[PDB]
Ligand binder design. Structure first.
Ligand SMILES: O=C(Nc1nccs1)[C@@H](c1ncn2c1CCC2)N1Cc2c(cc(C#Cc3ccc(CN4CCC(CO)CC4)cc3)cc2C(F)(F)F)C1=O
Length: 306
């Protein structure tokens, strides 16, 4: 089968364990065993919470092909779909988990080089989506996955539109115009990018923690923003603050964020002030708890050598 979006039979994959139980579905660790091909590919399987009509299923398939068409090292591709009473979505298993949990878990061994490199990687992935004319609408550190500690990828950019974001909800990541008027653009994704950077620089703080979602548009209109993370120089904070300008056309563009964070990544200790920075190290595959705790098969990347 050479289809870009594989249509899977239930016999071709198995849910082995639960990973995560999220707003719109449950994600499982499993194996994809493509019929006749005698090979087992570690995958994540998301099973949607609600049963869908044959009408829901048509809109899902059309969007699914877009999600299987992306080809960028910083973007998670949809490998396949299975349409039964439930919809199941299959992707490569990202065996270090999401970046939000990763920065909370490793908050004492993450140095300036890693944080700035992730900022670059996320900006490159978002710029690739902008080139595909795709608005994410739900960018957050929970939706960035860790392939290796050195390399992260954007996911879950195919949800918000189909779930009705643009018609009559991650308020604390949303641009003011998204809250007020359901306007979603690459420039509203820049706002979410700024909040995602804030989550990384705070080692996974909750934005506006304990502030009611219903009060966020008012505090944004009064000019209040997320506070400067303790490790950040004013050079890095000013990038975040520029992502949260009310004028969406004045916010940085992803291609400008790639250039500026790439510059900072060349001299990372100038731009982030982390005690113990120089001596910091993160578990490899072999050493990682999280890694062995998924895995211990052919990796999706090997199998798909086009
Ligand atoms: O698959 C996904 N995540 C995974 N993680 C692990 C394994 S798979 C993520 C995702 N997005 C981008 N990517 C990924 C993975 C790789 C890259 N996706 C793609 C994805 C998801 C959801 C839906 C959905 C839905 C849905 C639609 C209509 C109703 C009914 N409602 C219509 C609207 C009406 C209100 O107007 C009310 C009723 C219900 C649901 C579709 C897709 C897509 F695009 F593939 F078709 C989803 O989450």
């Amino acid at each position: 089968n050479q289809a870009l979006l594989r249509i899977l039979k239930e016999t071709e994959f198995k849910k082995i364990k639960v990973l995560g139980s999220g707003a719109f579905g449950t994600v499982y660790k499993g194996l994809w065993i493509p019929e006749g091909e005698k090979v087992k590919i570690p995958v994540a399987i998301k099973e949607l919470r609600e049963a869908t009509s044959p009408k829901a299923n048509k809109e899902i398939l059309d969007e699914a092909y877009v999600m299987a068409s992306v080809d960028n090292p910083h973007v998670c591709r949809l490998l396949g779909i299975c349409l039964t009473s439930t919809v199941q979505l299959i992707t490569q298993l990202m065996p270090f988990g999401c970046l939000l949990d990763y920065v909370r878990e490793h908050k004492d061994n993450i140095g300036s080089q890693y944080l700035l490199n992730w900022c670059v990687q996320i900006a490159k992935g978002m710029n690739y989506l902008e080139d595909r004319r795709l608005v994410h609408r739900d960018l957050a550190a929970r939706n960035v996955l860790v392939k290796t500690p050195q390399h992260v990828k954007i996911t879950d950019f195919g949800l918000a539109k189909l779930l009705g974001a643009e018609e009559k909800v991650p308020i604390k990541w949303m641009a003011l115009e998204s809250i007020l008027h359901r306007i979603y653009t690459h420039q509203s994704d820049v706002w979410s990018y700024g909040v995602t950077v804030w989550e990384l620089m705070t080692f996974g703080s909750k934005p506006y923690d304990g502030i009611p979602a219903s009060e966020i548009s008012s505090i944004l209109e009064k000019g209040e923003r997320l506070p400067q993370p303790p490790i950040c120089t004013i050079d890095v904070y000013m990038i975040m603050v520029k992502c949260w300008m009310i004028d969406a056309d004045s916010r940085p563009k992803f291609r400008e964020l790639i250039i500026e964070f790439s510059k900072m990544a060349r001299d990372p200790q100038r731009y982030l002030v982390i005690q113990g920075d120089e001596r910091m190290h993160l578990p490899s595959p072999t050493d990682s708890n999280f890694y062995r705790a998924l895995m211990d098969v052919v990796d999706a990347d090997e199998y798909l050598i086009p």
